[PDB]
């Protein structure tokens, strides 16, 4: 119901400071804890090495194999799972290749029916995965 006092500025300032920690959006941007757990060091992209090609089953209502990959990041030696989009496009990737990884669209949240994947492959050997798919370039 709040004060409304005309000399109660201190009470109002203290009230807003305490109650601003109760929303996840404000807390996440001010806490430095999600940044440390983020495999990317607060960046939009990262480079890594391919360790293995794996198949991830889709969630229950759907039924498919999603053709993901396991990548170790160069900057801090963390392991993640990245999705490889588009038809085929797994034949362009080999073990020990160098890839560029970006996020999905939901800022660290898993998307679609893929269980726990929040990254996707963007470049391989510094050519461009979608360009290879449309045959505009050849893999070096």
């Amino acid at each position: 119901t709040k004060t409304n006092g005309q000399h109660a500025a201190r009470k109002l300032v203290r009230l807003r400071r305490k109650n601003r920690w109760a929303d996840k959006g404000w807390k996440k941007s001010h806490t430095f804890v999600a940044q440390k757990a983020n495999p990317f060091g607060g960046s939009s992209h990262a480079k890594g090495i391919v360790l293995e090609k794996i198949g991830v089953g889709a969630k229950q209502p759907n039924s498919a194999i999603r053709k993901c990959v396991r990548v170790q990041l160069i900057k801090n030696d963390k392991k993640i799972i990245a999705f490889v989009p588009n038809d085929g496009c797994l034949h362009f990737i080999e073990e020990n290749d160098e890839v560029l990884v970006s996020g999905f669209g939901r800022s660290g949240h898993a998307v679609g029916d893929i269980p726990g994947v929040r990254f996707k492959i963007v470049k391989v050997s510094s050519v461009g995965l979608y360009a290879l798919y449309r045959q505009k370039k050849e893999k070096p």
Binding site: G5, Q6, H7, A8, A9, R10, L12, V13
Partner: protein
């Protein structure tokens, strides 16, 4: 100008200034204060609760920059 707060040291007293600070976002005031140490001549005999007028002078000690000019 200020209010005498304590007269424990030798030839020195502490005065307190009370003022209101305006917070723009809430359009309201809040109370603040500041303590200042000044030099008092023996010709004055202030007691806590009194009102004094002080004037700036050259540095006289580590924290003293004012001198008592009048006791009301």
């Amino acid at each position: 100008r200020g209010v005498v707060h304590s007269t424990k040291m030798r030839r020195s007293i502490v005065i307190r200034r009370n003022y209101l600070h305006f917070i723009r976002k809430y359009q309201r005031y809040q109370k603040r204060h500041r303590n200042i140490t000044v030099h008092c001549s023996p010709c004055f005999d202030p007691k806590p609760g009194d009102e004094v007028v002080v004037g700036q002078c050259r540095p006289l000690s580590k924290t003293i920059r004012y001198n008592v000019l009048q006791v009301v």
